[PDB]
Symmetry: D2
Subunit: 237 residues, 4 copies
């Protein structure tokens, strides 16, 4: 099985796998049963923004989510990612629906990783920024039901020709290049990610959510990971 670290924007409360009884933001370390959660006042049909930050000095994975005109939600968890993830990873976005559903539309995604060595300075970095997505977006690896180019956006889960979200859908987008998150000479390693999203549903109960994740380079959607598993995990262990 893959190795996954993720920040989840979890729209549906599954209380038997430890979700709180409300939409929430969570930090997931090798399990869908988040290590830490915070209440998230999710707004159906509004564009929101998520930010994720980490560095190897402090060893704290943190995230913040907001909408215009609204207060933010934040969550943090102390974890040494070099003890969880391999030295080379891929980074991605994932989303799912089940019997309950929503659009999982990404309007923008940026990421920056840096490795500073002890050689005079000495800086190594990767940065990408998407503010549109075209039909043939060659620097993304699309998995499952994910598509690019409809209204210039990344649709992680299936949307009907009329714009209605579909149930029982899972999809992911991974950046094409592998990312180097640990190196033996690094004195500080850091990453930051931001994405803007639009979660809409005809229903009072949207599901299931969107996640930013970091994985082994060869990660793939686990079998049966629709719905509450967010396209990330094979089971709820």
């Amino acid at each position: 099985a893959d190795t996954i670290v993720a920040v989840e924007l979890d729209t549906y409360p599954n209380t038997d796998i430890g979700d709180p009884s409300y939409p929430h933001i969570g930090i997931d370390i090798k399990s869908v049963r988040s290590k830490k959660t915070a209440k998230w006042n999710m707004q159906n049909g509004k564009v929101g923004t998520a930010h994720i930050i980490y560095n190897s000095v402090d060893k704290r994975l943190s995230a913040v989510v907001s909408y215009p005109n609204a207060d933010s939600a934040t969550v943090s968890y102390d974890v040494d990612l070099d003890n969880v993830l391999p030295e080379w990873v891929r980074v991605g976005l994932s989303a799912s629906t089940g019997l309950y559903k929503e659009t999982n539309t990404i309007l923008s995604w940026s990421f920056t990783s840096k490795l500073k060595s002890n050689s005079t300075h000495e800086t190594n970095a990767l940065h990408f920024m998407f503010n549109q997505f075209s039909k043939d977006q060659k620097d993304l690896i699309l998995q499952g039901d994910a598509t690019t180019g409809t209204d210039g956006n990344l649709e992680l889960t299936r949307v009907s020709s009329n714009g209605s979200p579909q149930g029982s859908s899972v999809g992911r987008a991974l950046f094409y290049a592998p990312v180097h998150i640990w190196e033996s000479s690094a004195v500080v390693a850091s990453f930051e990610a931001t994405f803007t999203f639009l979660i809409k549903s005809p229903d009072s109960h949207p599901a299931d959510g969107i996640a930013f994740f970091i994985s082994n380079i060869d990660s793939s959607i686990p079998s049966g990971s629709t719905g509450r598993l967010l396209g990330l995990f094979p089971d709820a262990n």
Copy 2:
């Protein structure tokens, strides 16, 4: 009196003001008596690099210092800088000598500050990078004995025409623009700084050190702040 937050590279042990009995890196919050220190294996005559990082989510000020071919030293301290510093600050480098002495030569200095609001994204930033310093470096405010342009470098303390460091010297360089470190709409604020330095002395006992600092915009060198006070503090309280 000014308000100062600093990371010190302290080359001389002053044990009556709480220094450990060796060169050390420290976090200074409104006092020269560091809140946290770590041992620093300072190398006379070699170029080193320091990195300083902070964000408002985690509220942890961290620093790392290294030389080529050597292990690093690191220190961290939990502190909410919005409860210490004003909303607008200046950022700078400071150094001093006393009866013991050293060169306090800066070969490069970079800084990045970011304020992310809840408006769609919404990013505000300041970045500067110096890899040389000319004679008339109009975007630096020089204080005390600091000069620019000798061999293209920033000499924080006085150096004789022959290159010998002088005693009883203090000097600082502040970036010209004020820096916005808190704003009411920000959901995450962060800063990072890096500088490369060359501390050389003819003597077995160099003094006194170099610091990266953040201050009120109108900060000036305190009277009598040569030597152990690092150009930062009026007394050792």
Copy 3:
């Protein structure tokens, strides 16, 4: 008199000073009588974006302006800016109204300048990005009628309490730090700027326009530079 280089977004045709008979984008080198113009299909009440680029190898000042859902306009002019401007400059935005009027609202402004020397690499840079403007925006020098903080924006010219633009107004905003655009060791120097603007008027004939400019560090609004002079020039020579 100041030395000015500017890219104008000129909303009102003043045919006796060489304007074409339509709104236009122009390159202004020490005169309001542009060296080069292109037709600009200005849209009253819509948010547009302008981009300005230059480097010292090619010695070509270029600009592009667009709106969502619309084609762009572009203009270029061959000019060695080191023969026009001093080594240190300030950068700014300017706008004016006369007997005809418009709002001259800035929603965002970014700028990046780089100087690459022949020392191993060797990079020097300044970058700033504003996506909001607060009441007391200490890193901007405001001149004339310019204000910050109304709806989080920079209003270059006066707007009544009800939001109606006023006539006979001029205002500018300059970044606080001086900018180094030439240095003797530089092998390549470049700059880029972007700003987003909202020009609205109750009238079929808006005036007078918005400009991005580069000037001597001590530049000030010339006497009598309302209206067709764009807050930039003392006369129409």
Copy 4:
């Protein structure tokens, strides 16, 4: 055959394929017979730096090369790259030796590409920076004799265990992700690259050179492209 655009640092004069009678920098558009050259005072055994710049407004490919303590060389050529290259490309470094030889050592490589659309702003970008290269550098595609990790560097051509360069060698390194250089909504597209290199030879006549290139995504070393063909072209047409 591949499609190649390159900036060559050509160390050996092959006068029957149009080289000048001295080491030179050149712009190569689909042929090893440069469209434009400039004299290059190459220094055996010293670390140099090359810079390459282009944007779609000006349609001018420019390059500058220098050493510390020395004047620069520059070359430019007017060319619309959207009429030469496909919309998606890979970027790389190439080098070769023949019967004459040299080390073709890369100490650092950075690249930035940007696509600005007409949507509010709207920025898309890719950036990478290498200041070291490890043994298993997963974000590089190595071709031919290229290796990474010896003394932390990228050795484009073969070097014996004792450090002597070998003859009859060719090697390339391409960044792993495809790069988007044209898009239908872009109003400005640009790229910049920088690399630092060390060309050393025991011989009074080093050969053959190093190039930065942009190619179709599936580019490979052409058969027989050692020596004067620089690992880029199948023949000297």
